[PDB]
From a paper:
The single particle cryo-EM structures of the 70S ribosomes from apo uL22 mutant S. aureus (SAuL22m_apo) and of its complex with ery (SAuL22m_ery) were determined at 3.58 Å and 3.2 Å, respectively. Erythromycin (ery), the first macrolide antibiotic that was introduced clinically, is composed of a 14-member macrolactone ring to which two sugar moieties, desosamine and cladinose are attached. It binds to the ribosome NPET wall at about 5–7 peptide bonds distance from the PTC 15 and blocks part of the NPET, thus preventing the progretion of nascent peptide chains. Interestingly, upon ery binding, G2505 is about 30° rotated towards C2610, which is 45° rotated, to form a WC base pair (BP) with it, where this movement seems to be at the final step in the mid-way movement shown in SAuL22m_apo relative to SA50S_WT.
The NPET, which is lined mostly by the 23S ribosomal RNA (rRNA) chain, initiates near the PTC and transverses through the large ribosomal subunit (LSU).
Numbering used by the authors:
A (entry chain 2): 2 to 44
B (entry chain R): 2 to 90
C (entry chain C): 2 to 275
Amino acid sequence: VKRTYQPNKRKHSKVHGFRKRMSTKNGRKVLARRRRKGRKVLS
Amino acid sequence: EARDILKRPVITEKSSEAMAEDKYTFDVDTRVNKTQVKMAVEEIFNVKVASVNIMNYKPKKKRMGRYQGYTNKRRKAIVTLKEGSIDLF
Amino acid sequence: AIKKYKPITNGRRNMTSLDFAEITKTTPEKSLLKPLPKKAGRNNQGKLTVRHHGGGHKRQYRVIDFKRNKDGINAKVDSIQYDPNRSANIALVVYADGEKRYIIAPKGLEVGQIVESGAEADIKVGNALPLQNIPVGTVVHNIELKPGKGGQIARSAGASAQVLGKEGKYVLIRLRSGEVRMILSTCRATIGQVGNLQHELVNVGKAGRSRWKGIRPTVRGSVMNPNDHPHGGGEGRAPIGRPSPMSPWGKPTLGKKTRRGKKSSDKLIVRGRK
RNA sequence: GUAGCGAAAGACGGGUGAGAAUCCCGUCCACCGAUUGACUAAGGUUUCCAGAGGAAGGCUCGUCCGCUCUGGGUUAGUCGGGUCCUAAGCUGAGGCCGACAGGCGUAGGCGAUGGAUAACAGGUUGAUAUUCCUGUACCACCUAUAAUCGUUUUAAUCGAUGGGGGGACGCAGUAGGAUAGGCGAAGCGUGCGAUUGGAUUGCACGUCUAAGCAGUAAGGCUGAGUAUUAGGCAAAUCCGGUACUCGUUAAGGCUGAGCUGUGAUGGGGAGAAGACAUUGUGUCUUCGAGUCGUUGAUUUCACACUGCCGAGAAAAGCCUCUAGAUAGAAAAUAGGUGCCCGUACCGCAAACCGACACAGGUAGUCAAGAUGAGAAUUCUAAGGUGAGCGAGCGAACUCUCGUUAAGGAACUCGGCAAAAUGACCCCGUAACUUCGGGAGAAGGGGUGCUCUUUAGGGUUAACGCCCAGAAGAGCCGCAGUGAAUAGGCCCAAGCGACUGUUUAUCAAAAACACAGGUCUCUGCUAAACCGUAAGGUGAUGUAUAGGGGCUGACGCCUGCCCGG
RNA sequence: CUACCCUUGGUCAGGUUGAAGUUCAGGUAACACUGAAUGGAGGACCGAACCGACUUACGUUGAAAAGUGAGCGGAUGAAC
């Protein structure tokens, strides 16, 4: 049957990914949280 | 530039069969275009160059005993000579 | 006239439509066309603000000359065409140098006849004049409300108002809804009734024909749930168990007047109905 | 030492090995065949190809890959994207609004799922190919090359920051025209069968591109010329309304147009071994093999034409006409030159989404013969695959399947399930109705094969070539749409008018919608709604309109009470 | 994923009925009714692809955290 999660590269870079997170202030807060935790991938 | 843009030759059986004709295969800097590669092999090896084809090879996944990683990416040029030849070995 | 359909399907049992016999050219003018994308009741925040607007046929906007500006230059009526954006038909006029415009087609208007604007113009069907120069008792349509703004009143199919009398800088005019009003005497209006009069009589016939005009369905309040509508809930069917009937946003809906106090046009409206 | 080992046909011989129901080769058999085939997207990211050991991996072994090593392996002026264009949206200097954070919004930007744009044939690897090689082309840019236009105003050229046109668009239906593919035949080739016969005999075959020369099958055309000018922010020599000459001819005047013949190509390839001393005779340097003739025809012409209402993007590329500007060009040759990103492999699946080598899901394109209306059904070509670790023996019971004496709903909550009906042709068909229907009502009959024949569809040339025109005369069987696939019907009541929609995953309905009614609000910065506001929807609408409530096709109708 | 919507694209074997309209003629004559040719309408009919999910059997430490088999509704539209 059809599942949740049908992947798409452009959509994945467009809702997450660096320039979308830097474009709002709460998004910049997720990148600051992820830096401060020391995550290997920020997005 | 002109001598940092050609890095290595490539020696394989496919590349050898290409050198049965006048084709030579180099590993080049990954930021150069193919006009620069034509100009560089004309400057270095003193020949005339018919055409050059080019392709990018992705990084390749690799293992060494619970160490995983990638190779470097490669830019391979294949240049066809018009006249002259090149004496690598 | 109106054509009746033969009952060959249950969906065509009582269906009628117009025969489109006033339409004389079935293809619009290319230079007077604009796009009209649908915005099916959703505002600039993208949320649904008016219910029941949906997706019908694709249409295109025809730009209509609602202010009759070109003045002292007569125009020949070229064709009467169909317009999906209104219930009147439209008329293509060509001015004496070659400028084409669309106007609203009045009731008896013929291909070939002459049409003009201004104070110098004369009282026959489709001429546009200031309300000052229009004799008392005639029927007019496409009536401006502020001078130069363009016509705003009585533009739909079969609509007209008539001039009743003259104040100082106002005229008295009786609108189609039966209210009488004062309009500035320098607002224009065109002579005659708006055509396509049988538009009110077409029976739509089948649910899907409504969907071809962009009407989504409407579900009544009394079969929703109590968080959805004030009429909602109840075990079986239920009466409207309130003192009055309500909106879905909870305002009394059957007789409560909603015009606001202290509008500036309250002193312009001498006698109102509906 | 239990359940399970995930749908499907395998058998034998050889080989290889320490060891084979498992791996490889062979032969036979089988399965899918509108697909378990062949391509292209998305997605995945080295799984692709060779070697060699697999300590684990696989519902085995390794004596494979999806572990190791590299040996690796992806080649573009023309393919798909960017150096083009805009839609929905998303952003947006100045601007507006807002405790802050921030929201909105102007020109403008960005943004394909659409528009625009130049390549085909053959050869070749273990692994790529419209990319490499060979041939033949096409498109751009730059520099030289010459005759031509020669107030540089104008002038073919330049050329708007300018204009007009085009690009440029629904749905249905029909009639044609071509062509792809399939089809029979002596044009031409191969072979002559072992079990009885026959030898007109079993077959097979006929080629080939983009580009460039010629013409062309049909399509649209108030169809070709004179003067004027409220306008095209000004110039136009171009765009519109009229007053006229052949006028409604379509000659052929024009634009556009499927396609055909020549050359491309006496090259490639060819049903061919006729060419080897060899490349393990497979292979090839040499040397040729036909380019006939019917039959009937999807896709394209073209949303061309006709009809209809619900009235069917934009912008650039492009074509015109100009100010203006300069000398001044261009053109046709010869040369150069043509960047970046993708490209391997899986791909209706063992490589994607599903924890899995999961009976699910996954957009588009191509699709041969028989039978038929058909892409249905059954068998089959091509091509794929024998199912993927499980396999060898032979009760109760459970599940799938087939048969059943006599009886025929007696079963049961209930004819649930099954059985029965079914295709085509011919005869016939009620009540009731909104006159459409009901209706395939019900109910009857027929169907194989052979020969005459008078004759149809004619294959018509005509009986011959198939179905038959359908009529006679025969033959066989238990049975003739001999398989498979293909409506059960009638009578009577409830509810709901109808097609439609609904509780993803226990409810598809009498519930919701609906076309119609009716009430009520709203005169336009409308009411209503979203928002703190600005903004916005309503609506680029204007009382024959818009929002809300109740009712629910149609027919006959819709009584009393205004005290609360 | 799902519910609505917006822009821009795509897909739908084959059969059957035969609307508005046109046109000729049995009864025909004040053509005129109704017979025949034409025409091709429809939230039409039957039925593949496609879309659904009514009954049933099987599955229920399932092959599967909603499926399979056989029947079944829709199938030019308020379609997918």
